[PDB]
């Protein structure tokens, strides 16, 4: 643990990115109660304004403050991304582990099922199902869908890992002395797979944010009067030519988030060589 | 060869046949096309509902509905939309429009990505690698719609600043162009510049990283050193002996990049106003119409599996460990 | 008022050149009276090539057209006889002289006495009694049965005159004008319709008794309404109506393109459902909700960078340009301190958040077209009603199903869509504003308004007809009928070389003078 | 005449994150035509760095100084497009690992054709391919015309090494550079490769620089030797002088710890303690000082120089006067006498009859078919007595490791009967199976894969104890006693495995196997893959443990020099059949079968006389 941490600590870009992500999450949840304008208030005397001394990041075509809208979009989008990444990693881990542990025709059938699921792009299937989830206050169902249709590409890596590590010598050595199978599982496989599961979650974070925001752009995701980042971008592109800030500010924020996530993922991966 | 390229085709046929079924039960469960005509405050008389449901086929279980759907699809009939118009009339045009874009985007993306990945893995940790591996990060970290809208903004700025219409970003072709094949072809390319560039950026971004990892793995082996120990130069041994052996893994990842391109084409088509399968899919899920979507998912599965099969042919042609053992 | 064409004298304008305009679809039927045939775009096309009796100034004032009818003059009042006299020197495109036969044929076709036709409406030719011979062959004399005030509405404005050979026999009217029009009398004549190429072309007429067009061709394309701005950028078409601020900004930053604005007669409005069963069933609640929505704010926010100082439209019959447009809006003033005060006194006391009668809650359904521009009005009305407790639930219906499934049969409590004013507005009423008559969705109406609507257009004097129409306007504002939100600021972006062509709003263009700026 | 190769003051230092490792520090030598010079040494001594620096194929971060002159023209600082004119046409390189030394997408005949086609430009492919077939015949690949179209994955390791040699000698070079060409090869294959190399040197007439770590190859191929330690030559003389009249103490230790088939069972070796120095930032003085059995303080002030000791003999030591004529045991002060074997128990602890194990072969990736039954285990009958050792010897593909791992599963095989301590494992319920696993424990092959990478040594050693019912008061004492028995310091009980050095990991593996005081150890090649000077220490440890405790081993190995030392009985295995058995001395001195004598004839012996 200590050597790994000080291996990551070395990666200045990765730690900077991770600190930026934590800062953005904390500010998204803690700053809005301090701003002069709430996200729902409408200021009809200042429409499409540049960043000024009253609306710190300007307003959109309706007079809504842009800062508060962006913060609420960040809340929704980042929370969904994190939750979906966690659930997808859990599902992928369980399926890949069982498939790679049983071996034989169970493994063949499970991997064939995974391929059959991968035959059609995941975005298409999610968009097909989404009419049911939409029109529902709880975002639980959207998270459940995004997680349940996004695990099939990493479960293959998990299965490769399980197969590779099941045959490694110290497992057989533990067998040859009377170590109970439960003790093997709690003591020999979990410590050696936990870190790579963490890495997988770190990348599925960005994957899920991308999927959810792309969904919201077309109108299938989060529906008004709630706002996600994709919704803000979709509204902004309507009047992007006249006043471009309304499109370029949320877009920039989104790109920043994604860059940070990707950087952290890569850094963490290269810190577990 | 023609025992690994045959058992690899029955597999694709079975996969497609089962996918075209599982994504019809999924569609017929998710979509309820009458949920708005059974909820109006002056709710219409029941006999209207029965007539509309019978006309739309939602009276028999899912299995019978799917059986009739296949019995008609194999005979070139694809049902009707929710407003009466047939699907077969539009299907050919939409397929053509989508394929024109996908082929160009994929070809340019994979070629550029392979070249950049090889260059980065050869010149590891030099300045060029450092700049390229972060440009790939940026391109991979911005969603498709952000890229498309930024390109539209840039094109508008360029047109306004220069003073003439350099770039066009609307429709597959421009209206009112009478002329021969050459005029129409130049016009078509003028429009094809940007939408295909949008997909090429993402494809190159992904394939650069994948190729860089593959070539790094190859450079960690000893046949390059052997090849240079016979008198080959560094470049001749790196290209003839090292790059070709690194090209093998790429032929297995092509069917994944193609799925990514299919996903991104929906956005590229919605934003630039192209009339293809992405626009049709958005229009089909917006109104919850079963036959449009049932055709689009079949087309998507077929295009992924075709790319997979061609990639497997390439992989057999390049790698001798499958032609003979 | 004050149309905003590039006023240049016709003589100095160069002789020749094309004029490439746009359409939305190839007209399946060319007959301009047949129900499918008629439309805004097709009527606009045929405007250039047909005869009309009256030409309307920038404010709806009608003056006789000396080209075609030397003098259309009413002569009596008890039977309402009007003497339409044809120009001595006038004939069709096939050389058959124009005579009263054409007038009689078209009046009979529009009469609806024999329902072998699909005429749009019998307005103006249902009250006709008899048109017969004059002193000379080139004069008709129309005697009416019920006195009429709008009588200029036939052979004028949006309705032109048709050849006798095409309106006499019912089969011809039904099915005749499908592949090109028949004879025409207008300074241009249609010469080619490349249905395979999606294009119409008009060319100078050989037999024009009047002036010479400063043009040569008005070739019409069929561009869809999305590649209509990006095709004025190229040299494909040179005219377009720009709607939003986005495309207004795009067009203004272009070489050779100038933006011209004179308010068009196209407004956009709320309408309330008064059928029994919906919440907006009673006069008082309907009239107290409308006193808690800011129309001035809705206008000033909706069209931000389209006009300067945008005020809403506050008259039901006349649009801003017309004459006789006084502010008829004193019954609702937006104050939420008289709205909320007779609202709770009415019996809708305030509960948690939104107020409710305890047997029901204020929830009002607001179906609107799914577009982005139409959503702003709903999102502003919703926020300005929330301060009163009226929860406005806004359902974004879209496209084709909006006027058939949901609006056409109640299925709504407040619906927003656009009407279209005209320089002859006295017929929009007795259609929309009455107990019966189609297009009165949300069947609100009273016996007195129906009694005072047959007196506004049984008059014989415009100076009094306008007063009666505005009294009707009082009667319709006074009972929660509908809220006229905005008037579209007709902005057309045209090639800066065009002259005597641009945004004229309600007024009518002169197709003999359009031409091109010299060189 | 300009000498064929002259290296002077060569120095090679890579660069890493921390200190720059100075791999080679100032060596110098000279190779003449028709002569063989062997650089001996082991672990990290910079032999391979010197080879790849002479050739020019060092990685792109290694920094090289000094002087290297090939027949007259210098090679350091030549551009790549100018140094590639010598490679292949005057230098022929043979590399270490054959299993990944050939590009896998070209037919081997085409790879030799490319070798012979780049340096002679106008040969024409029609002649290059014919010459490639001639070379394939010359090296000794069977029936070469057909095999000239075989991709590299369709050949065994010996075939691949033969193809690499064919590539090396394609253009008739003038200097061969062999970089451990016969490690990771079977014994007989290695003998054949040495014959091939001798034939290549005779036909070519070149001079060879062979880089080995074993002494038999040096005594059987080379003509002079240079012993390398810590990146410097420490002794250099003829092979006969080096084996007979060595002077540097490192050479004494290196030659005293090489097992010999001549030795009787139970003879101890002479292990050099410690581990080779880390080359990043040496301390001053002799690099051998930390491990030298004669080290005095003078040896620490300054580093000795390669000094002339005898006629054509140089030693880098200052106390050689005390090494001449003294046997390695005398210098290192060890007793190599085999202790008189006491009368042990003569009972039988393992007994296998007629054992057989099958393996199906399947062709087809997605769908598998049944075409053949390879019998890697066919009809084996062996047995083991108390206090003795039975060494199973065979080559790769002989089904000895699988026989061991089949015995260790303690289950009923397809045929034959397995007796362990008197219980026929077919009649063994799982309770008795758990009760018996406390009397036979296994020592694995790969030290680093047989240990949990992220567990302190205490946990690894106490795993058998914790899993079998010992309290936290007792496992502490038992683990403390075990570290002293094996040889590690108590202070290592809190150190992770990854920081131990090669031999200590195997020592920990032995300790873990030794926890429950079993009566049988099953050793699976646990000493190969180690430096010779560490093999000696572990071998002595095993012999002493058997002498003192009374253990019984089951020793599976591929080389026979140590099996002579350890095993009391032997069992030669061929393709899954035990072809010979009996007491070790009789089999190893008077063999009968043809395979056994082929095997014994193919083992090198470090006697050059
Ligand atoms: S010089 Fe000294 S330390 Fe070095 S090997 Fe000789 S005696 Fe040992």
Curated annotation (Swiss-Prot), chain A:
GO MF annotations, alphabetized: peptidoglycan peptide transmembrane transporter activity
One biological process term in Gene Ontology: protein transport
InterPro entries: BP-dependent_transpt_permease, MetI-like, MetI-like_sf, OppC_N
Entry's transmembrane regions: 15-35, 78-98, 109-129, 135-155, 202-222, 240-260
Alphabetic keyword roster: Cell inner membrane, Cell membrane, Membrane, Peptide transport, Protein transport, Transmembrane, Transmembrane helix, Transport
Gene Ontology cellular-component annotations: plasma membrane
Subcellular location: Cell inner membrane
Entry keyword annotation includes Transferase: no
Limits of the ABC transmembrane type-1 domain: 74-265
Gene3D superfamilies: MetI-like
Topology in the lipid bilayer: Multi-pass membrane protein
Function, in words: Part of the ABC transporter complex OppABCD involved in the uptake of oligopeptides. Responsible for the translocation of the substrate across the membrane. Glutathione (GSH) uptake by mycobacteria through the OppABCD system contributes to the depletion of the GSH pool in infected macrophages, which impairs the ability of the macrophage to detoxify methylglyoxal (MG) and contributes to enhanced production of inflammatory cytokines.
Protein family: Belongs to the binding-protein-dependent transport system permease family. OppBC subfamily.
Subunit and partners: The complex is composed of an ATP-binding protein (OppD), two transmembrane proteins (OppB and OppC) and a solute-binding protein (OppA).
Protein name in the entry: Oligopeptide transport system permease protein OppC
Organism: Mycobacterium tuberculosis (strain ATCC 25618 / H37Rv)
Gene: oppC
UniProtKB/Swiss-Prot annotation, chain B:
MF terms in GO: transmembrane transporter activity
Compartmental location: Cell inner membrane
Keyword field: Cell inner membrane, Cell membrane, Membrane, Peptide transport, Protein transport, Transmembrane, Transmembrane helix, Transport
Principal location: membrane
Signal peptide: none
InterPro entries: BPD_transp_1_N (IPR045621), MetI-like (IPR000515), MetI-like_sf (IPR035906)
Any one GO BP annotation for this protein: peptide transport
GO CC entries: plasma membrane
Membrane topology: Multi-pass membrane protein
Pfam families tied to this protein: BPD_transp_1, BPD_transp_1_N
Membrane-spanning residues: 12-32, 102-122, 135-155, 189-208, 248-268, 290-310
This protein's record includes keyword Transport: yes
Domain ABC transmembrane type-1, first and last residues per copy: 102-310
Family, per entry: Belongs to the binding-protein-dependent transport system permease family. OppBC subfamily.
Function, in words: Part of the ABC transporter complex OppABCD involved in the uptake of oligopeptides. Responsible for the translocation of the substrate across the membrane. Glutathione (GSH) uptake by mycobacteria through the OppABCD system contributes to the depletion of the GSH pool in infected macrophages, which impairs the ability of the macrophage to detoxify methylglyoxal (MG) and contributes to enhanced production of inflammatory cytokines.
Subunit structure: The complex is composed of an ATP-binding protein (OppD), two transmembrane proteins (OppB and OppC) and a solute-binding protein (OppA).
Protein name: Oligopeptide transport system permease protein OppB
Species of origin: Mycobacterium tuberculosis (strain ATCC 25618 / H37Rv)
UniProtKB/Swiss-Prot annotation, chain C:
Transport among keywords: yes
GO molecular function ontology, one term from the record: peptide binding
Subcellular location: Periplasm
Pfam families hit by this protein: SBP_bac_5 (PF00496)
GO annotation, biological process: peptide transport; protein import
Phenotype of null mutants: The uptake of glutathione is compromised in the oppDA knockout mutant.
Entry keyword set: Peptide transport, Periplasm, Protein transport, Transport
GO CC list: ATP-binding cassette (ABC) transporter complex; periplasmic space; plasma membrane
Keyword field contains Transport: yes
Top-level taxonomic group: Bacteria
InterPro entries: Peptide/Ni-bd, SBP_5, SBP_5_dom
Free-text function comment from the UniProt entry: Part of the ABC transporter complex OppABCD involved in the uptake of oligopeptides. Peptide-binding protein that shows broad specificity but a moderate preference for hydrophobic oligopeptides and those that are 6-16 amino acids long. Can bind the tripeptide glutathione (GSH) and the nonapeptide bradykinin. Glutathione (GSH) uptake by mycobacteria through the OppABCD system contributes to the depletion of the GSH pool in infected macrophages, which impairs the ability of the macrophage to detoxify methylglyoxal (MG) and contributes to enhanced production of inflammatory cytokines.
Known partners and oligomeric status: The complex is composed of an ATP-binding protein (OppD), two transmembrane proteins (OppB and OppC) and a solute-binding protein (OppA).
Family, similarity comment: Belongs to the bacterial solute-binding protein 5 family.
Protein's name in the database: Oligopeptide-binding protein OppA
Native organism: Mycobacterium tuberculosis (strain ATCC 25618 / H37Rv)
Name of the gene encoding the protein in the UniProt record: oppA
Curated annotation (Swiss-Prot), chain D:
Chief localisation class: membrane
Gene Ontology BP annotations: peptide transport; transmembrane transport
Binding-site residues for [4Fe-4S] cluster, renumbered to this chain: 286, 292, 299, 317
Effect annotated for changing residue 299 to S: Shows a significant reduction in the proportion of OppD in the Opp complex. Strong decrease in ATPase activity
EC numbers, comma separated: 7.4.2.6
InterPro entries: AAA+_ATPase (IPR003593), ABC_Ni/Peptide_Import (IPR050388), ABC_transporter-like_ATP-bd (IPR003439), ABC_transporter-like_CS (IPR017871), Oligopep_ABC_C (IPR013563), P-loop_NTPase (IPR027417)
Membrane topology: Peripheral membrane protein
Major enzyme class: translocase
Regulation: ATPase activity is stimulated by the oxidant H(2)O(2) and significantly decreased by several redox agents, including the reductants L-ascorbic acid and sodium dithionite. The 4Fe-4S cluster plays a structural role and might also affect the ATPase activity and the regulation of the substrate transport.
Catalyses which reaction(s): a [peptide](out) + ATP + H2O = a [peptide](in) + ADP + phosphate + H(+)
Localization per record: Cell inner membrane
Domain called ABC transporter: residue spans: 5-255, 350-600
Keywords per UniProt: 4Fe-4S, ATP-binding, Cell inner membrane, Cell membrane, Iron, Iron-sulfur, Membrane, Metal-binding, Nucleotide-binding, Peptide transport, Protein transport, Repeat, Translocase, Transport
An annotated Gene Ontology molecular function: transmembrane transporter activity
PROSITE patterns reported in the protein's UniProt record: ABC_TRANSPORTER_1, ABC_TRANSPORTER_2
Pfam families: ABC_tran, oligo_HPY
Positions of ATP 1 binding: 43-49, 61, 96, 213, 495, 499, 503
Result of altering residue 317 to S: Does not affect Opp complex assembly. Small decrease in ATPase activity
Any one cellular-component term (Gene Ontology): plasma membrane
Gene (name only): oppD
């Amino acid at each position: 643990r200590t050597l790994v941490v000080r291996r990551f600590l070395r990666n200045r870009a990765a730690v900077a990115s991770l600190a930026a992500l934590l800062l953005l999450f904390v500010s998204a949840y803690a700053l809005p109660p301090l701003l002069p304008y709430s996200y729902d208030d409408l200021d009809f005397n200042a429409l499409l304004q540049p960043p000024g001394t009253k609306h710190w990041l300007g307003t959109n075509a309706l007079g809504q403050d842009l800062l508060a809208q962006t913060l609420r979009g960040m809340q929704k989008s980042m929370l969904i991304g994190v939750c979906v990444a966690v659930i997808s990693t859990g599902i992928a881990a369980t399926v890949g582990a069982i498939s790679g542990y049983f071996g034989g025709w169970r493994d063949r059938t499970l991997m064939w099922v995974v391929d059959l699921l991968l035959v059609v792009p995941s975005f298409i299937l999610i968009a097909i199902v989404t009419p049911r989830t939409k029109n529902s206050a709880n975002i639980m169902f959207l998270v459940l869908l995004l997680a349940g249709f996004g695990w099939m590409i990493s479960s293959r890596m998990v299965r490769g890992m399980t197969m590779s590590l099941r045959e490694r010598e110290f497992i057989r050595a533990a067998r040859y002395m009377g170590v109970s199978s439960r003790r093997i599982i709690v003591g020999h496989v979990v410590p050696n797979v936990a870190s790579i599961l963490i890495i997988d979650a770190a990348l599925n974070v960005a994957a899920a944010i991308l999927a959810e925001t792309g969904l919201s752009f077309l109108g299938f995701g989060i529906q008004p009067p709630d706002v996600s980042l994709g919704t803000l971008i979709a509204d902004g592109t309507a009047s992007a030519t006249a006043f471009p800030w309304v499109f370029l500010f949320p877009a920039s924020i989104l790109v920043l988030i994604l860059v940070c996530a990707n950087l952290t993922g890569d850094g963490l991966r290269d810190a577990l060589d | 060869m023609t025992r690994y390229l045959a058992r690899r085709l029955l597999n694709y046929l079975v996969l497609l046949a089962l996918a075209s079924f599982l994504t019809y039960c999924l569609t017929s469960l998710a979509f309820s096309p009458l949920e708005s005509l059974m909820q109006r405050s002056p709710r219409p008389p029941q006999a209207v509902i029965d007539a509309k449901a019978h006309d739309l086929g939602l009276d028999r279980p899912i299995l019978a509905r799917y059986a009739n759907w296949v019995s008609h699809a194999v005979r070139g009939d694809f049902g009707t939309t929710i407003t009466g118009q047939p699907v077969g009339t539009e299907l050919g045009r939409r397929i053509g429009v989508s394929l024109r874009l996908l082929v160009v985007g994929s070809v340019f993306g994979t070629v550029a990505g392979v070249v950049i990945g090889a260059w980065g893995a050869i010149r590891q940790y030099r300045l060029s690698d450092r700049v390229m591996t972060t440009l790939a990060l940026l391109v991979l970290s911005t969603p498709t719609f952000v890229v498309a809208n930024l390109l539209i903004l840039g094109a508008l700025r360029v047109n306004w600043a220069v003073g003439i219409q350099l770039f066009d970003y609307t429709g597959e072709t421009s209206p009112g162009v009478a002329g021969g094949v050459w005029d129409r072809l130049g016009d078509r390319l003028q429009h094809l510049i940007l939408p295909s560039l949008t997909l090429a950026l993402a494809a190159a971004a992904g394939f650069s990283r994948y190729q860089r990892n593959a070539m790094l793995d190859v450079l960690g082996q000893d046949f390059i050193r052997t090849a240079r120990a016979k008198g080959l130069t560094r470049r001749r041994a790196l290209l003839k002996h090292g790059l070709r052996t690194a090209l093998i893994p790429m032929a297995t990842l092509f069917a994944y990049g193609v799925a990514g391109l299919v996903t991104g084409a929906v956005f590229v088509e919605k934003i630039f106003g192209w009339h293809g399968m992405g626009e049709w899919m958005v229009r089909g899920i917006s109104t919850q119409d079963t036959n449009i979507v049932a055709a689009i998912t079949v087309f998507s599965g077929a295009v992924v599996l075709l790319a997979g099969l061609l990639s497997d042919v390439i992989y057999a042609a390049l790698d001798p460990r499958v032609r003979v053992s | 008022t004050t149309s905003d064409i590039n006023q240049q004298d016709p003589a100095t304008l160069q002789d020749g050149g094309n004029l490439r305009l746009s359409l939305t679809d190839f007209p399946p039927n060319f007959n301009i009276l047949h129900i499918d045939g008629n439309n805004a775009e097709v009527a606009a096309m045929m405007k250039a090539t047909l005869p009309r009796a009256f030409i309307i100034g920038p404010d709806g004032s009608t003056t006789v057209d000396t080209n075609y009818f030397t003098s259309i003059e009413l002569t009596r009042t008890a039977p309402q006889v009007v003497t339409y006299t044809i120009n001595p020197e006038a004939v069709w495109s096939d050389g058959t002289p124009i005579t009263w036969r054409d007038i009689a044929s078209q009046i009979h076709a529009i009469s609806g006495a024999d329902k072998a036709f699909e005429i749009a409406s019998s307005s103006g030719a249902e009250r006709v009694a008899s048109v017969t011979r004059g002193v000379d062959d080139r004069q008709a004399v129309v005697t009416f049965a019920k006195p009429y005030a709008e009588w200029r509405g036939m052979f004028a404005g949006n309705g032109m005159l048709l050849p006798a050979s095409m309106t006499a026999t019912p089969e011809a009217f039904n099915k005749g004008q499908l592949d090109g029009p028949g004879p025409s009398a207008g300074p241009f004549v249609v010469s080619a319709l490349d249905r395979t190429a999606q294009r119409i072309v008009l060319t100078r007429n050989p037999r024009w008794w009047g002036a010479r067009p400063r043009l040569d061709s008005i070739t019409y394309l069929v561009l869809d309404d999305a590649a209509r701005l990006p095709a004025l950028q190229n040299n494909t078409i040179d005219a377009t109506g720009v709607g939003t601020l986005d495309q207004l900004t795009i067009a203004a930053r272009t070489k050779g393109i100038s933006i011209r604005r004179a308010p068009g007669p196209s407004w956009y409005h709320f309408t309330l459902n008064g059928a029994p069963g919906s919440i907006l069933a009673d006069k008082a609640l309907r009239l107290a909700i409308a006193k808690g929505i800011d129309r001035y704010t809705i206008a000033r926010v909706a069209q931000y960078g389209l006009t300067s100082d945008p005020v809403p439209l506050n008259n039901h019959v006349f649009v801003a340009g017309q004459d006789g447009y006084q502010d008829n809006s004193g019954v609702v003033a937006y104050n939420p301190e008289q709205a909320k005060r007779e609202l709770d006194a009415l019996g809708w006391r305030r509960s948690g958040a939104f107020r409710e009668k305890d047997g029901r809650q204020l929830v009002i359904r607001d179906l609107f077209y799914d577009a982005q521009s139409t959503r702003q009005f709903a999102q502003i009305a919703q926020h300005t009603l929330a301060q009163i407790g009226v929860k406005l639930e806004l359902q974004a219906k879209s496209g084709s199903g909006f006027f058939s499934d949901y609006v056409n049969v109640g299925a709504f409590d407040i619906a927003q869509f656009g009407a279209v004013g005209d320089a002859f507005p006295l017929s929009s009423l007795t259609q929309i504003y009455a107990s019966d008559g189609e297009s009165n969705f949300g069947k609100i109406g009273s016996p007195q308004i129906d009694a005072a609507i047959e007196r506004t257009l049984a008059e014989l004097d415009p100076g009094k007809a306008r007063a009666l129409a505005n009294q009707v306007d009082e009667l319709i504002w006074a009972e929660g009928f509908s809220l006229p939100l905005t008037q579209s600021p007709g902005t057309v972006a045209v090639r800066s070389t065009l002259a005597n062509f641009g945004a004229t709003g309600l007024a009518d263009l002169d197709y003999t003078a359009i031409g091109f700026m010299r060189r | 005449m300009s000498p064929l190769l002259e290296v002077t003051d060569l120095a090679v230092t890579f660069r890493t994150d921390g200190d720059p490792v100075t791999a080679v520090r100032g060596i110098s030598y000279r190779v003449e035509p028709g002569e063989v010079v062997a650089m001996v040494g082991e672990s990290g001594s910079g032999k391979s760095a010197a080879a790849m620096a002479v050739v020019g194929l060092l990685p792109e971060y290694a920094q090289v100084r000094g002087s290297v002159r090939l027949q007259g023209t210098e090679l350091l600082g030549l551009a790549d497009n100018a140094m590639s004119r010598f490679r292949g046409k005057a230098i022929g390189t043979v590399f270490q690992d054959p299993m990944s030394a050939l590009t896998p997408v070209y037919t081997v005949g085409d790879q030799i054709a490319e070798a012979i086609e780049v340096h002679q430009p106008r040969v024409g492919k029609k002649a290059a391919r014919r010459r490639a077939v001639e070379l394939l015949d010359l090296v000794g690949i069977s029936q070469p015309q057909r095999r000239s179209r075989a991709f590299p994955h369709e050949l065994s390791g010996g075939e691949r090494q033969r193809v690499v040699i064919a590539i090396a000698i394609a253009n008739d070079p003038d200097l061969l550079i062999c970089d451990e060409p016969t490690t990771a090869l079977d014994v007989t294959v290695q003998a054949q490769i040495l014959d091939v190399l001798k034939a290549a040197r005779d036909v070519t007439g070149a001079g060879v620089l062979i880089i080995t770590h074993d002494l038999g190859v040096v005594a059987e191929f080379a003509d002079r030797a240079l012993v390398m330690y810590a990146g410097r030559v420490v002794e250099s003389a003829g092979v006969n002088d080096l084996y007979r009249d060595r002077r540097m103490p490192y050479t004494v230790g290196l030659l005293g710890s090489v097992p010999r088939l001549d030795a009787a069972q139970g003879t101890r070796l002479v292990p050099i303690p410690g581990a080779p120095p880390s080359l990043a930032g040496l301390a001053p003085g002799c690099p051998f000082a930390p491990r030298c059995p004669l080290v005095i303080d003078e040896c620490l002030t300054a580093e000795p120089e390669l000094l002339d000791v005898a006629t054509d003999h140089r030693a880098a030591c200052i106390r050689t006067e005390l090494v001449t004529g003294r046997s390695a045991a005398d210098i290192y002060r060890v007793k190599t006498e085999a202790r008189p074997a006491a009368l042990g128990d003569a009972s039988v602890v393992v007994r296998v009859r007629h054992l057989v194990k099958t393996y199906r072969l399947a062709k087809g990736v997605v769908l598998r078919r049944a075409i053949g039954e390879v019998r890697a285990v066919d009809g084996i009958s062996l047995e083991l007595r108390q206090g003795r050792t039975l060494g199973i010897v065979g080559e790769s593909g002989s089904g000895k490791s699988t026989t061991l791992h089949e015995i260790l599963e303690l289950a009923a095989p397809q045929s034959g009967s397995i007796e362990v301590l008197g219980t026929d494992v077919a009649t063994l319920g799982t309770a008795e199976r758990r009760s018996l696993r406390r009397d036979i424990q296994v020592v694995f092959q790969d030290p680093v894969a047989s240990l949990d990478p992220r567990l302190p040594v205490f946990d690894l050693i106490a795993e058998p104890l914790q899993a079998n019912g010992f309290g936290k008061n007792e496992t502490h004492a038992r683990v403390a006693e075990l570290l002293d028995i094996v040889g590690l310091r108590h202070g290592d009980a809190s150190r992770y495995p990854a920081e131990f050095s090669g031999g200590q990991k195997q020592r920990i593996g032995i300790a873990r196997a030794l926890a429950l005081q079993p009566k049988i150890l099953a050793l699976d090649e646990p000493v190969s893959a180690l430096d010779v000077s560490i093999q000696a220490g572990i071998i002595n440890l095993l012999l002493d443990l058997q002498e003192q405790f009374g253990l019984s081993y089951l020793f599976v190995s591929h080389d026979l020099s140590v099996v002579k030392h350890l095993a009391h009985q032997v069992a030669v295995m061929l393709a899954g059949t035990v072809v010979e058995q009996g007491d070790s001395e009789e089999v190893f001195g008077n063999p009968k079968h043809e395979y056994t004598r082929r095997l014994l004839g193919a083992v090198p012996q470090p006697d050059p006389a």
